[PDB]
């Protein structure tokens, strides 16, 4: 409560002149509009009261031209066709056309109200934050009625209409705890037992040693054997930060990446690929 | 039982209130909204009685707000509409646009009355469990009646329409029984059968004494035969837990898939590639 | 007919007391409470008769209490909307909300009944068989009236809608005949075919002395010539099981395979890549 | 005509009975019940003579409970609302509630119209014939109103519902004449043209001395020339069978292949692979 | 106009006793049929007249059948209940039970008549001509109103239904022009251009003196240049025939085939391997 | 305007023998058909003139028909039930019947006013130019009301439905500008960069020398670099036709292809596969 | 307000002359058509005061004549349906033909109000840019009502219904920042990193000197470690142009990539192959 304390007064004096001149009039016109330039006006404060509660700057305001441009009618509309010219003659032509314009603007306003639902009901972002539609990873930075505009990782701009997104699952990783790194490498079925022991250890000793950027917990990981040649091996690490930061994400796991490929020089672990038996003729 | 022994009589005293002030009334506007402002007080506790029937903190309390709202306007609208102001002239107007707001809002009610059984009647989870959506395991963490609110296994939070996933199958590993695994290999074709023999018996033995991680029923079986070069085999076997422990599935495997390494080599089997002629010009 | 002999009597007697005081009450309210307090437990037994004829013992009984609820309804709202509160005042705003509440509960309750129809009438399973729904083999235990409990060949578990599931087609290992198997095998398309007669002949005398696991009738195929290189090859035969049991089946199958193994080189039979020139610079 | 002869007598006696007494009576209600006990026998006989001129045993027999369960209504609701309590009262509020239950069973009403029409207007296959669905071949063995059932060539029965069948093409391969072979095989592109002249007039000559399983007429066809190294081809010839007969058409077809085998290398036609140049540093 | 000038009679004859037996009646019943046993006959030829302009001799009389027997409906349903029995009290109740059934037959109503659109109006094919349906080709051999029945290459029977071809594309071989061949083939990118050039004037002589099957106009075209290895070349010429003469396509295709193969060795073309480097330790 | 200043003459002089004997006639049923054989006839020119205005020749007169028989209709329908035989008792029995046949022709005259905005507004193509559809590039022949007739590129005759057309991006070669070649071709790595600098400009002498073929600007791209082994590069170049002359963009294609071969080992550029290590055993 | 202040004058004298000839002719059909000459003259305003406020200077005008003609029917149907001949005769036939064609124009009413919100709220794109649709890049160059054209790189032309596209995400590279490139090579694995310590250094050297067509801000990143034999990497900058200027992207990235290539060997990186071991029989 701050400025309805104040506004709601402006229809206040409305409600007390339309009980001033309802005794100095009946001791039927002009008694018929005092009760309709009042029927708006505590109709408009249902709108203030009901959104000043309300999710964006940019929408609560696209928003607030939409019902008070539907409230400037249905005062209207209930002043002459029911306050002032007489009922049931023309009061039921016009709603022939009030239905046959539901077969035109009525898909139309399914979408406007599904996309209300989306933005300020379901609300799965915010203008600034980094978010996955497809497998599409996508800035958003500005968030309309209609429409979310996004931004990729190469910089284009993209226009995706809310009610289409509002059917699908979003992630958001600005929302999200701190996240996690795969990194991938194949040895040699060969290896010995005691040097994968031996890298296992030396992985876990860098993780240390660097807590700025990784979490101490961790596993290393065997997914398939191939062929009698091949140990398919990943290991499983933790972020600091989460995917919203997208460039330091790529360094830090590139320099990763290039420790890793230097223990397993260390240690001499190798692949190496299946001989050939050769018949010669 | 608990609360409705106390609170219905709120509505009790109301009861004896309008039996009060008819008698002493009729020795009409008064009268008629002592019925009204207990039809809403009996129409309060048929929301209170068959809410603390019922599936989540979250929202039954955001559904408790919501039949709040239609049942404090179903008093309202049948107390001007239908108990002081007299009936039949503007009661065939507003359902007009009664029925024009269900081109707007109808279909977004339609989603809100599936989310609603998909939440308390179908409930495929809980809040803290690992779920299966379309081949991504998901933790739950907030249940809402619109949306559930998911972490992947890279804890990326997913915000997923209930309207959605009340169309597919859903897994949940929590509700499940001890889970099982599959190891797959691969042999040599012209490997002899008793060593294939002993590799079973050496296989058994392994699970019996580590009857902590692994079930002792297990089958090893022969998938393809390809080229008469390779065997392709797989082992089966069952774990303790459910993969609602990932962390754990994924170590424990690790170690089973590093124990059939080490007996195919004390055993002496491997795997070759096929022989090639050349002639040489 | 076992205990509507003697429950149909407790409508009876109320038969027999609204033909009692309506001659002593006709030497208007109570008169039209009898009949009223008569119509459900008729309405009370044309349940009850026509429920005691049906195909599951979880959701008969999900279902007696859907039926009981909505004809403890349709006695109320033809009590006092049709037998004392005098007609069409309130008979015709109640039809504007009830039509109002089928663009809510329309949708799901065609959903509700399109799963009775597959339950009770289409019914491809019952508790306890294993069935396959996309290629997914998945046993059932908990047949609902809106969800049906699957387990998979891992023991996870699944919930599946049973509205989905009334638009595919299901198989049903249980209600099968004994199953079939394959194995396939490829050979050099040089082998002799006095060879390829000798392995006919003994693949069939293998079948022959394990009847208890195998069906006399089989057939060896020729599926392809590739490259004047390689025959692929396939052996069709008949289990005395079916894929109900499935571990089972894959231990047959295995033994099956190493049979054929072993006949394949006694008979000297093998396959060999295709020859390469070398042109030496 | 075998039944309705002696049959619509049972009706024809009160055809007699109710311009009987309408005479005697008028010289209202047990004259306004012999015309419906007289409407449903009129209207059962249009059952039983539209009836008796229809495609299954099992369906017309589960369809006729169908229409005689529903004119058993339309005789009775038709006899209390229409001809002994008197009208326009209760004529018009089960109009609603008609009109309801057709927002719940009306679109699986629905689905059992598009399952008659395919089972007895359509008619694309009988019990005991082998049709292809989508590439899968499958034998039918029941025919209900809303399921067909089928068994696959391993012998797993599927459970399919007739509306979705209805929007597909079926294949009948009973309904067929004799059907065609495809044999494929490759050879090198340096083969003389003589020898491809020799081998078209030696496998014409195989298939003039087998006329209990081949037709005559045949084409042998080169479909691509790939790398100036392989020439594919085919040879396309009739069986003198359909595929109802799956067992016998693979084992025709095995030895088919067999002797194109034999025929090759008698002409000594072969193919090899592209030569290689090795720089030896 | 040949029976209509001689069957419209058979009306007229009650066109002249309708208006005999009105002067000398009236100088009610056996007034009201005489006009209702000529508003069929009436009816009638604006069936015989309007289906006498009417592209298929079993789709013609499956539909006469049809449209005779709802004209031999709303003849009787005008004459009970429009014509004798007395208007506006049972006018009003089968009027919601043809609605009802507008829930049930309304949907195969539509397919109904979108199949009877696509046979007669769009008509894309005849009885005896082979066209081409996803890339399926097949011949048409039965034309009904609900259902196409096909053949296809290998002489399996096909039923589709005329409501899911009615929104597919239709290509139709016997309608076409005469048709286009396209033969590859792949050469050395070391080929000299003085023998591409004799190349194309040795395929242009051979499609000149066979005017019989080839067309003289025709391209040899150059698709890709791989790996500075390979040539990837085309022949683009035109048939007398289209591909409704199947097995004639491929046999004159297949000796295009062949004579290519031949000019190729003639002139010294040919197509090898790019070189390999061996380092050998 | 050129036949409406002769033709409407012909309703004036029924618009002045309405006039006419109405004062001699009023100094009811030859009075009220003068008014509805006028009613029709100026109906009859907003016909002719508002389809004066309008893009087929075939489709304008299949469309001519179509609405001279629904004003045919509409004449008659006012004449009888709304100009003759009086009023409001017939007059609401055939619109039951009128919205009946809205559930069958319905969707089928929906298909036909989508169909004639697709060819009458939004217009994408006409008779006699190369078109694409969804890969397939397809000349336009016929343009019905309900079906377009395409040829392939093999002259094979496609008919499509105008409907599902108009729901598709379509491209017109005939509406295009001069339109874009591609060749791409791949060079070693290691190719010097003043090797590519002459290819360059080699490439670019070329294009300038064939100003009747090709555009003088054009660019030579870098697309990938593979392994350190292979740059993969492209030339876009413009022609002076768009592609709807198919086979003169083939025949120049052609000739490009083979210039730039000839540039290539002009300057002694090539491609290398990569060494391979052997160590011999 | 530039002509507004001018020509509402023109309804404005008739605004005078209906207050004129009111009293001077009620001191009633010319008395109600000057309010229906004036009726429309307002509802122009409304119109081009609501109209002078809009995003394309073809579907301005386009939408112009559309509103135009549908304000100039309810003029003319409200003032002889409204104002001349009297209501409620023929006021209630014409709604139903209203009725009933929107079972025809109504679909295509509903493409046209959802491709007006497309054009002119949503607002996309403007004429002149390039955008990307699905994953194919086109420049805008006509925008109408119901169908945008577009031309793609090769300057193909497409016409795409605006309904279509108003469900889709649409980029546009206009309306974006300056924007990424991505160059992608492979190296060995085995090189040491102090080499790639001396590429990043060298590479971020020529960004540096070149800064009319590079940002400053780059990364270069590992993506994989393949089988101990290659590192994937990628280089990552940013244009100081859009992807709207395509063949300068092009050359622009040709240049980087080259110099890349520069780079790599004189730093002497490469790539081998794995080593292969031949066991000479």
């Known amino acids: 409560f701050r400025n309805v304390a104040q506004p709601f007064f402006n229809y206040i004096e409305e409600e007390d002149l339309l009980r001033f001149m309802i005794k100095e009039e009946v001791d039927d016109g002009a008694a018929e509009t005092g009760r309709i330039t009042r029927k708006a006006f505590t109709e408009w404060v249902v709108k203030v009261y009901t959104s000043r509660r309300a999710d964006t700057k940019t929408a609560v305001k696209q928003l607030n031209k939409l019902v008070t441009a539907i409230l400037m009618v249905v005062t209207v509309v209930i002043w002459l066709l029911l306050l002032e010219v007489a009922t049931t ?6 709603s022939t056309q009030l239905v046959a314009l539901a077969f035109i ?4 306003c399914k979408n406007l109200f599904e996309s209300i639902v989306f933005v300020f009901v379901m609300h799965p972002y915010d203008v600034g934050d980094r978010c996955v539609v497809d497998g599409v990873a996508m800035l958003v930075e500005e968030m309309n009625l209609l429409t979310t505009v996004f931004l990729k990782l190469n910089n284009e701009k993209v226009y995706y209409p809310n009610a289409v997104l509002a059917t699908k699952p979003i992630s958001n990783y600005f929302r999200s705890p701190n996240m996690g790194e795969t990194v991938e490498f194949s040895i040699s079925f060969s290896t010995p037992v005691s040097k994968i022991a031996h890298l296992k250890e030396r992985i876990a000793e860098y993780l240390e040693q660097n807590p700025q950027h990784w979490a101490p917990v961790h596993s290393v990981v065997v997914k398939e054997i191939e062929n009698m040649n091949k140990l ?5 690490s933790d972020h600091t930060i989460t995917f919203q930061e997208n460039r330091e994400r790529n360094l830090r796991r590139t320099e990763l ?13 190798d692949y190496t690929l299946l001989p050939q038996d050769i018949n010669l003729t």
Chains 1, 2, 3, 4, 5, 6, 7 share one sequence.
Not at 89 to 94: E, G, R, W
Not at 257 to 269: G, P
């Open 257 to 269: 990446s290039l420790a890793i490929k230097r223990m397993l020089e260390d240690l001499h672990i």
């Open 89 to 94: 003659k023309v009061l039921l032509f016009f």
């Open 105 to 108: 603007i009525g898909s139309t």
């Open 232 to 236: 398919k091996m990943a290991l499983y």
